[PDB]
């Protein structure tokens, strides 16, 4: 039983004394401010626990309790989302008419004329239209009343209180020892089996006993207050067997392995529900039940306390071949002694999963009536692309913090890390060449087209009409997925998504999903994507690989992860740190994700979204202009940015005037950021000197001597306002555009 619970009791005293002493956590900051730099250095380094403490135990304790604090905030956030749905929303009116009522769960106070924001969202209601997709979640959950939304809100508040108690309790009363945190086999067994496996299984149970009966009655057309309460399905097994006759047999088919009996509610239909335009919830129930089984199975792989299981160290040390030296030896020690190495992996994977979520949810719309709510489809795609891109760049941020700090060459001799660092010139030169090739052969095709169209030579352009760059591999994969039902997925009845080909699914005369054809414009913008992702990898990988040393600076690890430069010598070493590649790679992430959401927005409006009428033909939002106009930059400028900015500019005096104001406000913040990005600290300190002089003249100089921001903080402030401004402009542009027309 070497996997055991070990706790120090009453480690840290619950006292308000350190609250009154800002900066108590570091030796530099605890002696108080003398310049204004102290104030900024206080906020900058506060959650950098491994910069304050030497011991991995105290660092692990601070992290565990801070994760409870984060959970408490998320539960509070969720509880408020339910309460605004319960109290300030048109949810009940939306349940009766999901295709007519626009979801709204935010009402403004009348103060300075701002009550114009309470627009007519429908259902005898005035409020701010919400695009987070909660209404579609709640109907998928089977909520059907505001009373149940109040109970969910209380359930979030109780959980929110319990997490903040646990964070206090596990830091101040019962803090686990380092040997508790260093149980990677136990944690993985429980997080696969217990968290993910029982998470899916329990949710499958809710889906089967609550979501499936309630949503069958809704899609049959029964009024929400005419629907039995969710526990009457749990007790009256006769009533549940009316909707799904397999329930007449109970749990004998489950235990005797006669699973085919359960095909009423555990289907493999594929495609969409014609009534709601969403995934069949009988499929999602089977999906979560099947996922639950193999998460519970996966969580029995590793060895804890009984000899059965794998040692993760043994798996890693055995995988070594003739190209890779000692192989994965020493990686277990890295990943059970470095939190940053763990955070680097988990941020890159969570960011990747968030990017996948964006693609899977628009193409295979999971919730009822979310596919034809186009403001939600655009909002949750754009939101989850940004979460993914940010989290991916923090994976390289913390891979750099690992390499600078937690990397020890003595324990990493001739293994995979040692070998990567020892040919990093070959990696970075090959990536650099790919990015030049990719930029020339993706963006240069656009420049070729701008010139040819401007020169009157439309026969010389790369277009469907002219020279054709077809995406044959993507078209071929689309062919296979339409052929899969009955052929390579024989028991499936419909395709995984109608985006691959097949029918047009219409709900309330609006397209839910329909085949997303790929042409020359799709070939061009996909290689635009591969170029922007590869350059982002190039900037971030070069920062991780050269974080400790270069040919330029032989001792970059002694300067740290985050330093501004090593002087104007060697020609100039401005922005040479690993932090400065995260800084430069967040711009190229911003560039990458901006083109992705622009590609998504224009393609869905031009080729997918719109209205169906007689003869079954579809009138799209921008009328199919993507194919012949997304091949030039002038087409993107004119037919996408200029044409679709009309709604946000003409929004003044409407309920969308808030988006019009945020459009201008974010344009401001973006431009203001360039003051911090294009300027240097030395100018601003000398300007402050004259301002200090005028204060000295009036005897009003401060005792905390004002300083210009650090070189790094000028970069961090410039990047933050650039991101706030750039993303905030697109947020207003996307939301005012798609609320008006979709």
């Amino acid at each position: 039983k070497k996997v055991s619970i070990t706790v120090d009791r009453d480690p840290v005293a619950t006292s308000f004394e350190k609250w009154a002493q800002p900066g108590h956590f570091s030796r530099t900051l605890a002696k108080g401010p003398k310049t204004t730099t102290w104030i900024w250095n206080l906020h900058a380094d506060v959650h950098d626990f491994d910069s304050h403490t030497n011991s991995l135990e105290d660092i692990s304790r601070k992290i565990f309790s801070a994760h409870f604090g984060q959970l408490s905030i998320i539960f509070l956030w969720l509880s408020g989302m339910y309460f605004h749905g319960a109290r300030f929303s048109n949810y009940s009116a939306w349940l009766s008419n999901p295709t007519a009522v626009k979801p709204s769960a935010q009402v403004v106070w009348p103060i300075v004329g701002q009550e114009v924001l309470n627009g007519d969202v429908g259902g005898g209601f005035q409020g701010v239209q919400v695009t987070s997709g909660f209404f579609q979640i709640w109907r998928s959950s089977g909520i059907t009343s505001e009373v149940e939304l109040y109970w969910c809100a209380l359930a979030g508040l109780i959980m929110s209180g319990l997490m903040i108690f646990a964070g206090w309790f596990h830091y101040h009363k019962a803090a686990p020892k380092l040997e508790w945190f260093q149980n990677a086999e136990s944690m993985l067994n429980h997080h696969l089996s217990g968290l993910l496996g029982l998470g899916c299984l329990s949710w499958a149970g809710h889906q089967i006993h609550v979501s499936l009966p309630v949503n069958k009655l809704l899609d049959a057309g029964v009024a929400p207050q005419e629907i039995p309460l969710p526990h009457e399905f749990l007790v009256n097994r006769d009533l549940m067997a009316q909707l799904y006759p397999s329930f007449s047999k109970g749990l004998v088919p489950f235990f005797t392995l006669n699973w085919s009996e359960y095909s009423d509610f555990l289907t493999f239909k594929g495609g969409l529900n014609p009534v709601t335009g969403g995934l069949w919830l009988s499929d999602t129930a089977h999906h979560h039940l099947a996922l639950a089984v193999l998460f519970i199975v996966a969580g029995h792989m590793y060895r804890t306390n009984w000899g059965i299981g794998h040692s993760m160290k043994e798996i890693l040390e055995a995988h070594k071949g003739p190209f890779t030296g000692e192989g994965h030896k020493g990686l277990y020690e890295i990943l059970t002694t470095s939190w940053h190495a763990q955070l680097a992996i988990n941020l890159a994977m969570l960011g990747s999963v968030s990017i996948i979520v964006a693609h899977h949810m628009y193409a295979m719309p999971p919730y009822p009536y979310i596919a034809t709510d186009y403001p939600t489809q655009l909002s949750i795609f754009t939101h989850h692309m940004w979460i993914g891109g940010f989290c991916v760049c923090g994976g390289a941020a913390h891979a750099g913090i690992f390499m600078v700090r937690d990397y020890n060459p003595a324990q990493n001799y001739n293994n995979l890390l040692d070998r990567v660092i020892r040919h990093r010139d070959a990696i970075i030169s090959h990536l650099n060449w790919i990015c030049i090739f990719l930029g020339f052969h993706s963006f240069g095709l656009y420049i070729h087209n701008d010139t040819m169209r401007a020169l009157g030579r439309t026969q010389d352009m790369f277009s469907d009409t002219a020279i054709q760059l077809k995406p044959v591999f993507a078209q071929w994969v689309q062919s296979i997925h339409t052929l899969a039902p009955g052929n390579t997925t024989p028991n499936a009845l419909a395709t995984a998504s109608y985006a691959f080909g097949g029918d047009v699914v219409a709900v309330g005369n609006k397209v839910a999903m329909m085949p997303i054809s790929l042409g020359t414009a799709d070939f061009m913008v996909h290689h635009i994507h591969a170029f922007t992702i590869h350059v982002t990898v190039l900037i971030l990988l070069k920062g991780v690989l050269f974080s400790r040393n270069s040919r330029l600076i032989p001792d970059k690890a002694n300067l740290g992860f985050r330093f501004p430069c090593d002087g104007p010598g060697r020609g100039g070493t401005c922005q040479s740190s690993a932090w400065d590649s995260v800084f430069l790679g967040l711009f190229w992430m911003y560039n990458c994700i901006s083109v992705v959401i622009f590609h998504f927005s224009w393609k869905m409006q031009s080729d997918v979204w719109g209205t169906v009428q007689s003869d079954g033909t579809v009138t799209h939002i921008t009328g199919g202009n993507f194919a012949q106009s997304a091949i030039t930059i002038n087409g993107w400028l004119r037919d996408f940015l200029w044409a679709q900015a009309s709604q946000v500019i003409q929004s003044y005096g409407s309920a969308l005037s808030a988006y019009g104001l945020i459009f201008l406000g974010a344009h401001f913040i973006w431009a203001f950021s360039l003051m911090f990005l294009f300027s240097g600290r030395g100018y601003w300190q000398e300007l402050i000197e004259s301002i200090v002089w005028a204060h000295n003249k009036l005897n009003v100089a401060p005792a905390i001597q004002p300083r210009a921001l650090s070189i790094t903080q000028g970069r961090a402030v410039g990047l933050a306002h650039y991101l706030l401004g750039g993303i905030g402009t697109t947020w207003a542009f996307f939301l005012a555009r798609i609320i008006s027309v979709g």
Partner: protein, 147 residues
């Protein structure tokens, strides 16, 4: 609308003057570099010590005032051109009402007058404004490459 833009033009004249005067008067020395005159007019910095000294030279204030000079002539020429194109149409009241807020400058000047320029070529043909339509994109490209 003319009152507001003249005070914006006043803001930009005093701010450009500020950077340039500060560059001229701190050129010989400052508190960060009291011996700044020993290094010349255009030097990169004095290194990361003393808090950091990026853009500390007198040349760098020329550099910084160049952005403010471009901004001010933009505000001047945007004003001149919008006031004149609305008068030349016979619709001076469009400038009178829309110039007092910034969305009027965005939609009634930049967005509204963009349409003949960005239609100099399109998938339906080209006309003699195709060269300015290409210079327009060319200018956005050079400007962004400077970033």
């Amino acid at each position: 609308g003319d009152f507001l833009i003249h005070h914006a033009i006043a803001l930009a004249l005093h701010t450009t003057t500020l950077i340039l005067v500060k560059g001229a008067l701190d050129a010989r020395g400052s508190k960060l570099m009291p011996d700044k005159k020993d290094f010349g007019y255009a030097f990169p910095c004095d290194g990361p010590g003393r808090g950091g000294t990026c853009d500390i030279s007198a040349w760098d204030a020329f550099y910084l005032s160049m952005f403010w000079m471009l901004n001010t002539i933009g505000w001047v020429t945007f004003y001149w051109h919008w006031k004149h194109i609305t008068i030349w149409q016979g619709n001076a009241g469009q400038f009178n009402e829309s110039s007092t807020y910034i969305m009027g400058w965005l939609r009634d000047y930049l967005w509204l007058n963009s349409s003949p320029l960005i239609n100099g070529y399109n998938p339906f043909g080209m006309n003699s404004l195709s060269v300015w339509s290409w210079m327009f994109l060319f200018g956005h490209l050079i400007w962004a490459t400077g970033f």
